[PDB]
Symmetry: D2
Subunit: 213 residues, 4 copies
């Protein structure tokens, strides 16, 4: 009952980790808004969540698109009211390329899906979030060490996401907490995320919580 009568937006909830987060919050009593760009994973989950007695909404959204992010956030707020949690799962390697292979468009595609998207969701969600609310971002070991062969653009965006998370923490607290998970199965990851989004972590903000999974 950690998320009783609470509304959680999981941004990028279509597969794997985001999907597992969506369900875990429902298992703990939350209304859950799922976003996706890519629909089966999300629909399923919506059904799983309804089967639990709980409420959910699935919304198509390209998270690099300021307008579709506004539309998604607004639907969530209009349906359930105050947002208690934003979990921003979207991101990805895209592909492996050395710098000689990357063109400017590819660089921006990676930075946009991992980093710009988070700027958009956090920016849009914040004015709607409940006092005591919380944001959880996803960083990566690649952000700390520079990443493996061909993953330069993705590593860079994750390091950015780590710095952004600490900076936003200071900017929006005490009202709103902001923490990163640095990723064991999808549901293990979701246990950690649910901890960070819960009042169990009322005094945790600006931090990176690592998990083998």
């Amino acid at each position: 009952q950690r998320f009783t009568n609470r509304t959680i937006v999981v941004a990028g909830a279509g597969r794997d980790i985001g999907r597992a987060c969506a369900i875990r919050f429902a298992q703990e009593g939350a209304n859950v808004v799922l976003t996706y760009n890519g629909a089966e994973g999300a629909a399923t989950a919506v059904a799983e969540i309804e089967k639990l007695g709980r409420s959910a909404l699935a919304i198509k959204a390209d998270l690099t698109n300021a307008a579709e992010v506004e539309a998604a956030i607004s639907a969530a707020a209009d349906k359930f009211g105050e947002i208690h949690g934003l979990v921003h799962v979207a991101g990805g390697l895209i592909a492996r390329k050395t710098i000689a292979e990357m063109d400017e468009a590819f660089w921006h595609q990676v930075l946009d899906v991992n980093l710009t998207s988070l700027f958009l969701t956090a920016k849009t969600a914040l004015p709607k979030m409940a006092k005591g609310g919380a944001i959880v971002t996803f960083s990566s070991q690649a952000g700390r060490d520079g990443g493996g062969p061909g993953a330069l653009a993705y590593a860079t965006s994750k390091g950015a996401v780590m710095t952004f998370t600490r900076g936003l923490a200071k900017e929006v607290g005490p009202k709103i907490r902001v923490n990163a998970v640095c990723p064991g199965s999808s549901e293990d990851v979701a246990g950690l995320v649910a901890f960070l989004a819960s009042d169990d972590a009322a005094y945790v903000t600006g931090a990176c919580y690592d998990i083998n999974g």
Copy 2:
């Protein structure tokens, strides 16, 4: 004598720190190429100070967020002096202090492009022209580690990105090239200035740092107000 017959490209001498680095390297015997954008009065000072040492800098106007102007500057440098031994990327800056509510998406990209994307373009363009054992020095910030001060969220984020980019690029382009970052703090309205940051940059570009790569070197003080 540290840089006698070495070609050093200082990208971002539109900033005071590039003025300081450009003069430092020339004082140490380097062939200096410096790019500039904006009013670039700091660049004009570097050029006139460099002439006073009896050599001459190749100074080139280039908005380093523009891939074409980045390629021109790199080509002209290669044309004039041959192999690039050092690229020092100092472009970037705070642009303005704004909370996330005050920032719009075009403000976000302006900060990230000037601080981070410019770094991608210039390293990407310079790399094929660089000498064996050449060094890149990037500009990070203690803000990159801790999230920065009030209103500096976009800037801090780009300074964290540069730190990670530096570690990745280092693994990718070594052993031929080294890549490292300076991590200054800020000047409050024992702190060193751009003249002292320039000293650490010169160190990282020198033969004494031949085996330093993928590192962020801290220094107290800095290039802008906190």
Copy 3:
């Protein structure tokens, strides 16, 4: 119910944080063993409060820098409750604020022994008695990252040592045992959580939801002593 029939050893309940952890694990169904040293008036509160839950803590006197008292405390716990599922090591502290010129070698060792050597001893001793999937939680500190405040150099140093010990030990004892650290700040005397909240982070790290966390340092703002 998170710790129902779990055996949790809180080593260092001579300190307020050990009072807070012991009561918290007891609230969540654990069999609690707590060791104590000094006036231990905090350990005495934990024991009385635990009794009021209708169970009974095993409280054991032990100076955790003394290998023999560590072995006894550990045996006594294994003898009473069987396999140890959780070792929470909270012994340590500042002792006194002294500059390097004011410290003597014996002072240096006193701080390092109570904070670090005690951890080596209790982890070394407990390991063979621990269950598969058991968790160790160690006590680091933000001062371990940044070098600490005025006069706290011996303490801070021991807290960075604890952080590195936590990472090496995790690589050595996994996958059977997890090892992690909490990393609090400090209470200013001028949103800071207290020992009750740090205890909540410890409980998490000892729990089933943290099965795939190991080798990590988990920060929390606020803490167990005055800055």
Copy 4:
């Protein structure tokens, strides 16, 4: 000329990195005190190379875990050369690889005393005899950051402590005295980094860890 008429103590200077440090410093004009606790060959070799350069050096046998020997070594430095400008604490070591079940309390103490207690002793002792503008340089390690490889638990722990100690001391003794770590390509390369941190080139660098692949 970076160390012209400056006195540097290199604690642990009989082999590899300390020996290279002691030499490098001489090459830039320093008076150099070398401590060693091993066979005295490497440290006398070095003393000889240094006099070849026309500079003064002094080797001293010292167990740096021994408070009395450290006091006598510092004291002899002072008598001979005057104010100390730089302490470079190179002493440290794995000693051996043992899992925690294999370590006894005496082994644990031995590793922490060689890597960590020695540094407490040498910094504590030198400090009151250091010149304004002086500098300490310690040796951390990637093991301090990541916990070390198999059997190296005690060594890694001592290294993490050395890193924290470096940052804490830097705040305690500045601005008068700077304190930094090298996190270690050959011994001469390492020595060039050390020399930089010990020099006025690093006047604004304190409380830091500088990495080198070496």
